[PDB]
Protein backbone atom coordinates (compact mmCIF):
# COMPACT_ATOMS: atom_id res chain seq x y z
CA UNK A 226 0.00 0.00 0.00
CA UNK A 227 0.88 3.69 0.07
CA UNK A 228 2.32 3.22 3.52
CA UNK A 229 4.76 0.60 2.36
CA UNK A 230 5.70 2.74 -0.62
CA UNK A 231 6.52 5.75 1.57
CA UNK A 232 8.67 3.60 3.88
CA UNK A 233 10.65 2.83 0.76
CA UNK A 234 10.97 6.53 -0.11
CA UNK A 235 8.96 6.05 -3.34
CA UNK A 236 7.17 9.13 -4.68
CA UNK A 237 3.40 9.12 -4.31
CA UNK A 238 1.66 7.98 -7.50
CA UNK A 239 -1.41 9.58 -9.12
CA UNK A 240 -3.35 6.37 -8.22
CA UNK A 241 -2.40 6.95 -4.62
CA UNK A 242 -3.05 10.68 -4.48
CA UNK A 243 -6.63 10.48 -5.83
CA UNK A 244 -7.60 7.75 -3.37
CA UNK A 245 -6.46 4.48 -4.91
CA UNK A 246 -8.65 1.59 -6.05
CA UNK A 247 -11.87 2.83 -4.48
CA UNK A 248 -11.52 6.26 -6.04
CA UNK A 249 -10.94 4.69 -9.50
CA UNK A 250 -13.94 2.39 -9.23
CA UNK A 251 -16.23 5.33 -8.47
CA UNK A 252 -14.77 7.42 -11.26
CA UNK A 253 -15.06 4.65 -13.83
CA UNK A 254 -18.66 3.89 -12.90
CA UNK A 255 -19.58 7.58 -13.32
CA UNK A 256 -17.48 7.81 -16.50
CA UNK A 257 -19.49 5.18 -18.37
CA UNK A 258 -22.81 6.61 -17.21
CA UNK A 259 -21.67 9.76 -18.97
CA UNK A 260 -20.34 8.06 -22.04
CA UNK A 261 -23.50 6.03 -22.52
CA UNK A 262 -25.74 9.11 -22.14
CA UNK A 263 -23.87 10.92 -24.90
CA UNK A 264 -25.73 10.17 -28.18
CA UNK A 265 -22.45 10.78 -30.03
CA UNK A 266 -20.82 7.82 -28.20
CA UNK A 267 -23.36 5.32 -26.96
CA UNK A 268 -23.70 3.26 -30.18
CA UNK A 269 -20.00 2.21 -30.07
CA UNK A 270 -20.89 0.16 -26.99
CA UNK A 271 -24.06 -1.39 -28.37
CA UNK A 272 -22.51 -4.88 -28.41
CA UNK A 273 -20.69 -4.58 -25.08
CA UNK A 274 -20.94 -6.25 -21.72
CA UNK A 275 -20.55 -3.13 -19.63
CA UNK A 276 -19.89 -4.99 -16.36
CA UNK A 277 -16.90 -6.73 -17.88
CA UNK A 278 -15.63 -3.56 -19.61
CA UNK A 279 -15.91 -1.38 -16.53
CA UNK A 280 -13.98 -4.15 -14.77
CA UNK A 281 -11.16 -4.02 -17.33
CA UNK A 282 -11.15 -0.17 -17.32
CA UNK A 283 -10.66 -0.06 -13.56
CA UNK A 284 -7.61 -2.33 -14.01
CA UNK A 285 -6.25 -0.42 -16.99
CA UNK A 286 -6.73 3.01 -15.33
CA UNK A 287 -5.29 1.88 -12.01
CA UNK A 288 -2.15 0.51 -13.71
CA UNK A 289 -1.79 3.55 -15.95
CA UNK A 290 -1.82 5.76 -12.88
CA UNK A 291 0.57 3.72 -10.80
CA UNK A 292 -1.58 1.16 -8.96
CA UNK A 293 -0.23 -2.38 -8.34
CA UNK A 294 -3.13 -4.31 -9.89
CA UNK A 295 -2.56 -6.33 -13.09
CA UNK A 296 -4.38 -5.33 -16.22
CA UNK A 297 -6.13 -8.48 -17.47
CA UNK A 298 -7.52 -7.09 -20.70
CA UNK A 299 -6.56 -7.01 -24.33
CA UNK A 300 -4.14 -4.56 -25.83
CA UNK A 301 -5.43 -1.06 -26.67
CA UNK A 302 -4.55 -1.06 -30.36
CA UNK A 303 -6.17 -4.45 -31.03
CA UNK A 304 -9.36 -3.73 -29.11
CA UNK A 305 -10.04 -0.37 -30.75
CA UNK A 306 -8.64 -0.79 -34.30
CA UNK A 307 -11.44 -1.05 -36.86
CA UNK A 308 -14.06 0.65 -34.72
CA UNK A 309 -14.19 3.94 -36.65
CA UNK A 310 -13.24 5.93 -33.54
CA UNK A 311 -11.96 9.41 -34.52
CA UNK A 312 -10.09 12.04 -32.51
CA UNK A 313 -13.50 13.77 -32.19
CA UNK A 314 -14.87 10.72 -30.34
CA UNK A 315 -11.68 10.17 -28.28
CA UNK A 316 -11.88 13.82 -27.18
CA UNK A 317 -15.49 13.50 -26.18
CA UNK A 318 -14.54 10.41 -24.15
CA UNK A 319 -11.69 12.32 -22.53
CA UNK A 320 -14.12 15.08 -21.58
CA UNK A 321 -16.40 12.66 -19.79
CA UNK A 322 -13.38 11.24 -17.91
CA UNK A 323 -12.38 14.76 -16.82
CA UNK A 324 -15.99 15.41 -15.85
CA UNK A 325 -16.17 12.25 -13.76
CA UNK A 326 -12.88 13.12 -12.08
CA UNK A 327 -14.14 16.67 -11.47
CA UNK A 328 -17.33 15.33 -10.01
CA UNK A 329 -15.33 13.10 -7.59
CA UNK A 330 -13.48 16.13 -6.30
CA UNK A 331 -10.11 15.52 -7.92
CA UNK A 332 -8.19 18.86 -8.14
CA UNK A 333 -8.07 20.23 -11.66
CA UNK A 334 -4.26 20.26 -11.74
CA UNK A 335 -4.36 16.49 -11.17
CA UNK A 336 -6.99 15.96 -13.84
CA UNK A 337 -4.72 17.70 -16.31
CA UNK A 338 -1.93 15.39 -15.22
CA UNK A 339 -4.18 12.38 -15.81
CA UNK A 340 -5.25 13.63 -19.23
CA UNK A 341 -1.51 13.86 -19.89
CA UNK A 342 -1.22 10.12 -19.34
CA UNK A 343 -4.27 9.19 -21.35
CA UNK A 344 -3.96 11.58 -24.35
CA UNK A 345 -1.08 9.71 -26.01
CA UNK A 346 -3.21 6.58 -26.05
CA UNK A 347 -5.27 8.15 -28.82
CA UNK A 348 -2.54 6.93 -31.11
CA UNK A 349 -3.68 3.36 -30.40
CA UNK A 350 -7.33 4.25 -29.99
CA UNK A 351 -8.35 6.27 -33.04
CA UNK A 352 -9.26 4.68 -36.37
CA UNK B 353 -19.68 24.85 6.86
CA UNK B 354 -18.80 28.54 6.93
CA UNK B 355 -17.50 28.29 10.50
CA UNK B 356 -14.95 25.63 9.59
CA UNK B 357 -13.96 27.50 6.50
CA UNK B 358 -13.38 30.74 8.38
CA UNK B 359 -11.28 28.84 10.88
CA UNK B 360 -9.14 27.76 7.91
CA UNK B 361 -8.77 31.45 6.89
CA UNK B 362 -10.66 30.93 3.63
CA UNK B 363 -12.20 34.08 2.18
CA UNK B 364 -15.99 34.29 2.39
CA UNK B 365 -17.48 32.93 -0.82
CA UNK B 366 -20.68 34.16 -2.51
CA UNK B 367 -22.21 30.78 -1.53
CA UNK B 368 -21.57 31.36 2.16
CA UNK B 369 -22.51 34.98 1.79
CA UNK B 370 -26.08 34.23 0.69
CA UNK B 371 -26.74 31.50 3.23
CA UNK B 372 -25.05 28.50 1.66
CA UNK B 373 -26.71 25.21 0.62
CA UNK B 374 -30.08 25.81 2.30
CA UNK B 375 -30.45 29.28 0.80
CA UNK B 376 -29.75 28.09 -2.76
CA UNK B 377 -32.31 25.29 -2.37
CA UNK B 378 -34.97 27.87 -1.66
CA UNK B 379 -33.93 30.14 -4.43
CA UNK B 380 -33.75 27.38 -7.04
CA UNK B 381 -37.20 26.12 -6.08
CA UNK B 382 -38.64 29.64 -6.62
CA UNK B 383 -36.55 30.19 -9.75
CA UNK B 384 -38.25 27.22 -11.36
CA UNK B 385 -41.66 28.41 -10.23
CA UNK B 386 -41.07 31.57 -12.27
CA UNK B 387 -39.44 29.85 -15.24
CA UNK B 388 -42.23 27.33 -15.70
CA UNK B 389 -44.84 30.16 -15.52
CA UNK B 390 -43.23 32.05 -18.42
CA UNK B 391 -44.95 30.93 -21.63
CA UNK B 392 -41.83 31.62 -23.65
CA UNK B 393 -39.82 29.18 -21.48
CA UNK B 394 -42.18 26.47 -20.26
CA UNK B 395 -42.20 24.19 -23.34
CA UNK B 396 -38.44 23.56 -23.01
CA UNK B 397 -39.17 21.65 -19.81
CA UNK B 398 -41.87 19.35 -21.19
CA UNK B 399 -41.36 15.93 -19.63
CA UNK B 400 -38.28 17.03 -17.64
CA UNK B 401 -37.54 15.38 -14.27
CA UNK B 402 -37.82 18.69 -12.44
CA UNK B 403 -36.78 17.00 -9.23
CA UNK B 404 -33.41 15.87 -10.62
CA UNK B 405 -32.98 19.17 -12.48
CA UNK B 406 -33.49 21.24 -9.32
CA UNK B 407 -31.00 19.08 -7.45
CA UNK B 408 -28.42 19.45 -10.22
CA UNK B 409 -29.13 23.22 -10.36
CA UNK B 410 -28.44 23.49 -6.61
CA UNK B 411 -25.12 21.71 -7.14
CA UNK B 412 -24.24 23.87 -10.12
CA UNK B 413 -25.01 27.28 -8.64
CA UNK B 414 -23.42 26.30 -5.35
CA UNK B 415 -20.18 25.32 -7.07
CA UNK B 416 -20.20 28.28 -9.42
CA UNK B 417 -20.65 30.49 -6.35
CA UNK B 418 -17.55 29.15 -4.53
CA UNK B 419 -19.30 26.48 -2.49
CA UNK B 420 -17.37 23.44 -1.24
CA UNK B 421 -18.92 20.51 -3.19
CA UNK B 422 -18.25 19.72 -6.83
CA UNK B 423 -20.95 19.86 -9.49
CA UNK B 424 -21.76 16.32 -10.56
CA UNK B 425 -24.10 17.03 -13.46
CA UNK B 426 -23.55 17.34 -17.21
CA UNK B 427 -21.60 20.26 -18.61
CA UNK B 428 -23.57 23.29 -19.78
CA UNK B 429 -22.81 23.01 -23.52
CA UNK B 430 -23.72 19.38 -23.80
CA UNK B 431 -26.90 19.57 -21.84
CA UNK B 432 -28.27 22.64 -23.71
CA UNK B 433 -27.10 21.55 -27.21
CA UNK B 434 -29.68 21.01 -29.93
CA UNK B 435 -32.40 22.98 -28.14
CA UNK B 436 -32.19 26.22 -30.15
CA UNK B 437 -31.97 28.35 -26.98
CA UNK B 438 -31.41 32.05 -27.80
CA UNK B 439 -29.93 35.00 -25.94
CA UNK B 440 -33.54 36.14 -25.53
CA UNK B 441 -34.35 32.96 -23.61
CA UNK B 442 -31.17 33.11 -21.53
CA UNK B 443 -31.94 36.70 -20.56
CA UNK B 444 -35.45 35.81 -19.43
CA UNK B 445 -34.04 32.96 -17.35
CA UNK B 446 -31.38 35.22 -15.84
CA UNK B 447 -34.12 37.72 -15.09
CA UNK B 448 -36.15 35.05 -13.33
CA UNK B 449 -33.08 34.10 -11.30
CA UNK B 450 -32.53 37.72 -10.29
CA UNK B 451 -36.21 37.91 -9.27
CA UNK B 452 -35.90 34.81 -7.09
CA UNK B 453 -32.76 36.11 -5.37
CA UNK B 454 -34.54 39.48 -4.80
CA UNK B 455 -37.46 37.61 -3.27
CA UNK B 456 -35.01 35.74 -1.03
CA UNK B 457 -33.69 39.03 0.34
CA UNK B 458 -30.23 38.87 -1.27
CA UNK B 459 -28.93 42.47 -1.46
CA UNK B 460 -28.94 43.97 -5.02
CA UNK B 461 -25.17 44.28 -5.16
CA UNK B 462 -24.65 40.55 -4.52
CA UNK B 463 -27.35 39.71 -7.10
CA UNK B 464 -25.26 41.75 -9.48
CA UNK B 465 -22.14 39.75 -8.52
CA UNK B 466 -24.04 36.52 -9.04
CA UNK B 467 -25.25 37.64 -12.50
CA UNK B 468 -21.63 38.39 -13.38
CA UNK B 469 -20.77 34.76 -12.71
CA UNK B 470 -23.86 33.52 -14.59
CA UNK B 471 -23.90 35.81 -17.70
CA UNK B 472 -20.71 34.37 -19.24
CA UNK B 473 -22.38 30.96 -19.32
CA UNK B 474 -24.58 32.11 -22.16
CA UNK B 475 -21.79 31.08 -24.52
CA UNK B 476 -22.31 27.46 -23.59
CA UNK B 477 -26.07 27.54 -23.09
CA UNK B 478 -26.94 29.19 -26.42
Ligand code: HEM
Nearest residue numbers: 269270272273281282285298299304310314315318346350
Ligand atom coordinates in the same frame (compact mmCIF):
# COMPACT_ATOMS: atom_id res chain seq x y z
C1 HEM C 1 -9.32 7.28 -24.23
C2 HEM C 1 -8.76 6.22 -23.65
C3 HEM C 1 -9.42 4.83 -23.69
C4 HEM C 1 -9.00 3.82 -22.95
C5 HEM C 1 -7.87 3.86 -21.89
C6 HEM C 1 -9.83 2.68 -23.25
C7 HEM C 1 -9.69 1.45 -22.66
C8 HEM C 1 -10.38 0.34 -23.01
C9 HEM C 1 -10.33 -0.94 -22.33
C10 HEM C 1 -9.45 -1.32 -21.10
C11 HEM C 1 -11.16 -1.77 -22.97
C12 HEM C 1 -11.43 -3.25 -22.64
C13 HEM C 1 -10.59 -4.14 -23.58
C14 HEM C 1 -10.82 -5.61 -23.31
O1 HEM C 1 -11.97 -6.10 -23.49
O2 HEM C 1 -9.86 -6.31 -22.93
C15 HEM C 1 -11.80 -1.00 -24.00
C16 HEM C 1 -12.73 -1.51 -24.85
C17 HEM C 1 -13.54 -0.73 -25.60
N1 HEM C 1 -13.36 0.59 -25.95
FE1 HEM C 1 -12.06 1.81 -25.09
N2 HEM C 1 -10.73 3.02 -24.22
C18 HEM C 1 -10.51 4.34 -24.53
C19 HEM C 1 -11.23 5.07 -25.43
C20 HEM C 1 -12.30 4.61 -26.18
C21 HEM C 1 -13.02 5.39 -27.17
C22 HEM C 1 -12.82 6.91 -27.42
C23 HEM C 1 -14.03 4.63 -27.60
C24 HEM C 1 -15.05 5.02 -28.67
C25 HEM C 1 -15.62 6.23 -28.58
C26 HEM C 1 -13.87 3.32 -27.01
C27 HEM C 1 -14.63 2.23 -27.29
C28 HEM C 1 -14.45 0.99 -26.73
C29 HEM C 1 -15.38 -0.11 -26.91
C30 HEM C 1 -16.72 -0.08 -27.66
C31 HEM C 1 -14.80 -1.24 -26.09
C32 HEM C 1 -15.30 -2.69 -25.90
C33 HEM C 1 -15.42 -3.39 -27.24
C34 HEM C 1 -16.34 -4.55 -26.97
O3 HEM C 1 -15.91 -5.46 -26.24
O4 HEM C 1 -17.51 -4.55 -27.40
N3 HEM C 1 -12.79 3.32 -26.17
N4 HEM C 1 -11.30 0.29 -24.04
Ligand code: HEM
Nearest residue numbers: 396397400401408409412425426431437441442445473477
Ligand atom coordinates in the same frame (compact mmCIF):
# COMPACT_ATOMS: atom_id res chain seq x y z
C1 HEM D 1 -28.54 30.65 -16.37
C2 HEM D 1 -27.84 29.78 -17.11
C3 HEM D 1 -28.28 28.30 -17.03
C4 HEM D 1 -27.74 27.37 -16.25
C5 HEM D 1 -26.62 27.59 -15.22
C6 HEM D 1 -28.44 26.12 -16.48
C7 HEM D 1 -28.11 24.97 -15.84
C8 HEM D 1 -28.65 23.76 -16.10
C9 HEM D 1 -28.35 22.52 -15.40
C10 HEM D 1 -27.37 22.40 -14.21
C11 HEM D 1 -29.09 21.54 -15.95
C12 HEM D 1 -29.11 20.04 -15.55
C13 HEM D 1 -28.08 19.21 -16.31
C14 HEM D 1 -28.09 17.76 -15.86
O1 HEM D 1 -29.15 17.10 -15.89
O2 HEM D 1 -27.01 17.23 -15.51
C15 HEM D 1 -29.85 22.16 -17.03
C16 HEM D 1 -30.72 21.49 -17.85
C17 HEM D 1 -31.63 22.10 -18.66
N1 HEM D 1 -31.70 23.45 -18.89
FE1 HEM D 1 -30.50 24.89 -18.20
N2 HEM D 1 -29.39 26.32 -17.49
C18 HEM D 1 -29.30 27.66 -17.84
C19 HEM D 1 -30.08 28.28 -18.77
C20 HEM D 1 -31.07 27.61 -19.46
C21 HEM D 1 -32.03 28.23 -20.35
C22 HEM D 1 -31.93 29.66 -20.94
C23 HEM D 1 -32.81 27.25 -20.82
C24 HEM D 1 -33.93 27.39 -21.88
C25 HEM D 1 -34.55 28.57 -22.06
C26 HEM D 1 -32.48 26.04 -20.10
C27 HEM D 1 -33.18 24.88 -20.24
C28 HEM D 1 -32.79 23.69 -19.75
C29 HEM D 1 -33.37 22.46 -20.19
C30 HEM D 1 -34.55 22.32 -21.19
C31 HEM D 1 -32.61 21.37 -19.47
C32 HEM D 1 -32.81 19.85 -19.53
C33 HEM D 1 -33.78 19.37 -18.46
C34 HEM D 1 -33.83 17.86 -18.57
O3 HEM D 1 -34.70 17.40 -19.34
O4 HEM D 1 -33.04 17.14 -17.92
N3 HEM D 1 -31.42 26.29 -19.24
N4 HEM D 1 -29.57 23.52 -17.11
